Structures are given as C-alpha cells and as structure tokens.
Amino acid sequence: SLRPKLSEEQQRIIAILLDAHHKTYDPTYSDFCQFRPPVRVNDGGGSVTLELSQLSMLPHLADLVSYSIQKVIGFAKMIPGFRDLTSEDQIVLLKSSAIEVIMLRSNESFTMDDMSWTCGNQDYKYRVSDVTKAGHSLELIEPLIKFQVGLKKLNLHEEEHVLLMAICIVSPDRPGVQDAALIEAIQDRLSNTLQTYIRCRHPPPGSHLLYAKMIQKLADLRSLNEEHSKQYRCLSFQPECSMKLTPLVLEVFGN
C-alpha cells in the first residue's frame, strides 16, 4: 500500500489552489447585500403558477450565481496549467462547468444544522423554498440537497475541496473542447496530486475509498448540470425573465 510523498510541484499546486480559493471565496458573504434584494412571496403551497408569475427570489439568486461565476472565472485562471490552454478551450471549460463549481463551492455555506445554505441573517439563508421561488422544481432541488449532504459527509480537507473544483473545471470530456489531450494532461496532474494527498495526508477511516467517492461526486454533478439546464431553458420562457437575470448568466446558460 505505497504512500509516495507529495512532490515539491504537488505541494506548490496545493498552495496555489488554496490561495486562489481564499482570494475568490469570501466566507463572510459580505458582498451579498450588494445584490438585488431577496424577496419571498407567500407560497406555502408551492404553486408553480405563482412562482413563475412572481419569480420573487430570481433577481437575488441570479445576482448570487452571476457573482459566483465571476469568482469561479478568477479561480480557474489560477489553476496551474489553465492558462496554457487556448482562450477558446478556457471559455468552453468555464461555461460548461460553471454551475457544477457553484454547486461544489456552495457546500461551504451549506449546513446540516437545518439543510440550508446559511450566508448571514435570515435574509441570506437560502432554503429549498427559495429555489422554488426562483422558478426551479423538485427534480433539481431534491438531488441537489442530497448531493450537498453527501459531499458534507465526506469531510473533505480544504486541500481536497479545492482540488475537486479544479478537476471539475479542467475536464477533457466537455462538448466543444479542441485540445482534449492537453486538458487531460492538466487534469491528470491535479488528479495525481489529489490521490497522493489523500493517501499520505488524510487519516483513516475517512480516507477509505475517498478518491473514488470524490470521482462519483463529479458524475453526480453532470446529472445536476443537465437537469439545471433543462429547467433554466423552461424558466427562460417566462416573459420578462431576462431582466431578472444578468448578461453573464444569460450567456452561460442560454440556448
């Protein structure tokens, strides 16, 4: 059961990704008061008609997602090797992974205390009912919550969390990529860093089959991505939806 030590290069990769995350994820959520304000209409019955008529939480959650895409673009640019890719492949990778990295990075605000993403006072505590007030349905939200709990229970080290986000972004099997072999080389360098880290720095029993569990979460994210895309397309049919979104969100998710 060999445990090769992390190379100097692998240690540098981990330090770079930790720094990149610390520069692009504010764990105080202090910018969120700058977004359009959250509004919660009375919708205890979960009425799709009402939810679509009002889309009360959409401006705020679209601003949150847009902000988060900006942060993910910045994080990606600091992944070792990402800037070796052509501009065209960088943009394909960013647009295809954005929602997945948002789901991953949001695990840091997710809490099993009450199954919410807690980003401050009540105003910035996001629950499943807030996501339905932004026009989404249970076929996305239920698996998303299940995903957040499963990821929580892996008890990832921050090193592993940031490696997982980087591996998600640098995926050679995204539609439209040109230099799949270069993307795969970059991804393999990150994957080998992660496997090596787990084996020499993650104590048992949480280390047991941990790499395989993390790779499974990447597959789960693909399913969530596809369901989000389907639901976004239907949300976009609502008259005046575009004004509730942002230009960046429209580009990343638009048809």
Ligand X SMILES: C=C1/C(=C\C=C2/CCC[C@]3(C)[C@@H]([C@H](C)CCCC(C)(C)O)CC[C@@H]23)C[C@@H](O)C[C@@H]1O
Query: If binding means CB under 6 A, how many residues of this protein chain bind ligand X?
Result: 23
Q: What is the DSSP string of 7-63?
A: PHHHHHHHHHHHHHHHHH--TT-TTGGGSPPP-----TT--HHHHHHH-TTHHHHHH
Ligand-binding site membership of 29 (annotated): no
Closer residue to ligand X in complex, CB, 29/211: 29
Ligand-binding site membership of 22 (annotated): no
119 binds ligand X (CB under 6 A): yes
Long-range contacts of 117-123 (CB under 8 A, 24+ apart): 119/29, 119/32, 120/29, 120/32, 123/37, 123/38
CA-based nearest residue to 167, from 55, 17, 27: 17
Query: Strand (E) positions, the chain?
Result: 110-111, 116-118, 125-126
Ligand-binding site membership of 21 (annotated): no
**Contacts (CB under 6 A) with ligand X, residues 26-65:** 58, 61-62, 64-65
Closer residue to ligand X in complex, CB, 72/186: 72
Closer residue to ligand X in complex, CB, 71/189: 71
Residue choice 6, 10, 93, 117 for contact with ligand X (CB under 6 A): 117
Ligand-binding site membership of 197 (annotated): no
Stretch that binds ligand X, among 82-90, 101-109, 156-164, 177-185 (CB under 6 A): 101-109
Residue choice 131, 167, 169, 177 for contact with ligand X (CB under 6 A): 131
93 binds ligand X (CB under 6 A): no
Residue choice 134, 169, 198, 210 for contact with ligand X (CB under 6 A): 134
Query: Which is it for strands 125-126 and 116-118: parallel, antiparallel or unpaired?
Result: antiparallel
85 close to 183: Cβ distance less than 8 angstroms: yes
CA-based nearest residue to 206, from 132, 254, 148, 155: 155
Spell out, one character per residue from 208 to 247, where the chain touches ligand X: x when CB under 6 A holds, - when not: --------------------x---x---------------
Question: Which residues, other chains included, contact 73 with Cβ-Cβ below 8 Å and sequence gap of 6+?
Answer: 94
Closer residue to ligand X in complex, CB, 126/197: 126
Residue labelled with tokens 């921050």 = 158
Stretch that binds ligand X, among 15-23, 103-111, 161-169, 202-210 (CB under 6 A): 103-111
Residue labelled with tokens 């072999």 = 181
Q: Which helix (H) or strand (E) holds 247?
A: helix 247-253
- Residues at the site binding ligand X, with contacts judged by CB under 6 A: 58, 61-62, 64-65, 68, 102-103, 105-106, 108-109, 117, 119, 126, 131, 134, 136, 140, 228, 232, 249, 253
Binding residues for calcitriol: 25, 68, 105, 109, 136, 228
